[PDB]
Amino acid sequence: GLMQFTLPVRLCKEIELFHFDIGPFENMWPGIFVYMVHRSCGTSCFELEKLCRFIMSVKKNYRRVPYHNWKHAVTVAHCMYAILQNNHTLFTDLERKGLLIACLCHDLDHRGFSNSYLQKFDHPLAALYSTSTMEQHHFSQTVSILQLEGHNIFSTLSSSEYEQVLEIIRKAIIATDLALYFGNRKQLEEMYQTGSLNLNNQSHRDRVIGLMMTACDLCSVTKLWPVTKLTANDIYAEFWAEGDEMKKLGIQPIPMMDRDKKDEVPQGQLGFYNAVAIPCYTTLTQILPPTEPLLKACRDNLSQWEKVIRGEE
Numbered sequence: 001g002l003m004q005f006t007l008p009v010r011l012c013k014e015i016e017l018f019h020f021d022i023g024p025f026e027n028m029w030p031g032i033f034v035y036m037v038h039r040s041c042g043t044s045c046f047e048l049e050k051l052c053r054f055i056m057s058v059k060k061n062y063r064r065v066p067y068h069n070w071k072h073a074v075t076v077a078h079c080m081y082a083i084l085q086n087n088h089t090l091f092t093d094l095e096r097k098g099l100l101i102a103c104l105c106h107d108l109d110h111r112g113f114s115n116s117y118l119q120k121f122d123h124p125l126a127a128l129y130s131t132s133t134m135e136q137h138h139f140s141q142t143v144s145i146l147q148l149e150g151h152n153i154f155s156t157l158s159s160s161e162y163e164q165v166l167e168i169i170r171k172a173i174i175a176t177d178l179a180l181y182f183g184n185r186k187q188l189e190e191m192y193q194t195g196s197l198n199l200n201n202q203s204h205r206d207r208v209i210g211l212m213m214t215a216c217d218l219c220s221v222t223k224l225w226p227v228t229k230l231t232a233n234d235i236y237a238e239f240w241a242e243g244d245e246m247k248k249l250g251i252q253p254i255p256m257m258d259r260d261k262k263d264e265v266p267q268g269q270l271g272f273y274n275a276v277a278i279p280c281y282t283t284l285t286q287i288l289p290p291t292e293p294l295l296k297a298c299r300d301n302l303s304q305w306e307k308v309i310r311g312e313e
């Protein structure tokens with residue numbers, strides 16, 4: 001009860017900012033996550049013994065892949081923490097509980113390959129789940145870990161609150177399927193413009209929570225340029241490995257995944273910021289004004305990629 005987590009002074013201050021980097025010390029990441037749960041939700045939301053045992057089980061079930069790893073999980077949870085803390089009153093007690101856990105779990109047991117590669121490989125998960133393949137697997141892995149003896153951090157909820165939180169987590173994890181983001185943001189754009197957007201409408205909250213997940217998932221583009229740039233190396237390290245595997249199946253990969261087309265990466269990043277990142281944080285800032293520092297950090301990083309193209313770096 002009376003046991004808070006405290007961070008060193010630099011982390012204590014910088015963790016509140018959207019652009020915070022969780023640092024290279026793996027052993028501090030669980031404490032960082034616990035700290036965020038305590039300030040975001042309360043010292044009471046979760047039994048510390050159960051929470052700690054859930055975090056270490058989730059960590060264990062992330063693989064040693066260049067990008068879709070335990071550091072990504074905690075990074076994405078931190079961005080969600082920053083959105084929730086800057087939008088205090090807009091979110092229920094349950095949503096704050098569910099969304100930090102959703103973020104921590106959203107890439108559980110990722111192998112470093114896209115849904116496309118699973119399908120073309122004919123991976124068993126592609127038979128079990130025809131769309132949002134990895135994302136249905138991540139939610140499946142989340143429910144499995146929650147059901148390990150001593151791991152049910154939600155045990156103190158009523159049957160109905162329990163079903164509500166697992167439903168928030170499921171929609172939230174599915175929403176991290178980027179193929180669904182485009183349509184989700186279009187509908188949110190229409191609803192905000194025509195003025196029909198209603199945060200009491202559960203189907204409208206769903207869409208908004210979905211956009212928050214896309215925004216947290218893509219948050220490497222909202223960091224200081226050196227974080228953004230070094231994370232991009234890890235992203236391409238997975239992409240190019242998948243391209244290699246595509247070539248093994250006798251399929252020429254898309255240029256994104258062809259290490260032979262490294263040259264075109266800066267232009268590929270412009271497409272990404274314009275097609276995906278900028279629209280995401282724009283609609284998000286329209287709906288949740290205090291998330292504007294994400295849009296501003298994203299535009300700064302678009303500007304940095306433009307400077308790479310122009311040979312200036």
Ligand SMILES: Cn1ncc(C(=O)N2CCOCC2)c1C(=O)Nc1cc2nc(-c3ccccc3)cn2cc1C#N
Binds near residue numbers: 218235255269
């Ligand atoms: C920064 N960032 N953060 C998240 C993601 C991302 O998408 N994730 C989905 C999957 O998991 C990893 C996170 C990216 C990203 O870089 N995305 C893209 C890069 C890219 N390069 C080229 C390109 C590169 C070279 C040549 C031609 C095209 C195309 N192209 C499309 C992209 C998209 N979308």
Ligand SMILES: [Mg+2]
Binds near residue numbers: 106
């Ligand atoms: Mg994912």
Ligand SMILES: [Zn+2]
Binds near residue numbers: 072
């Ligand atoms: Zn992710």
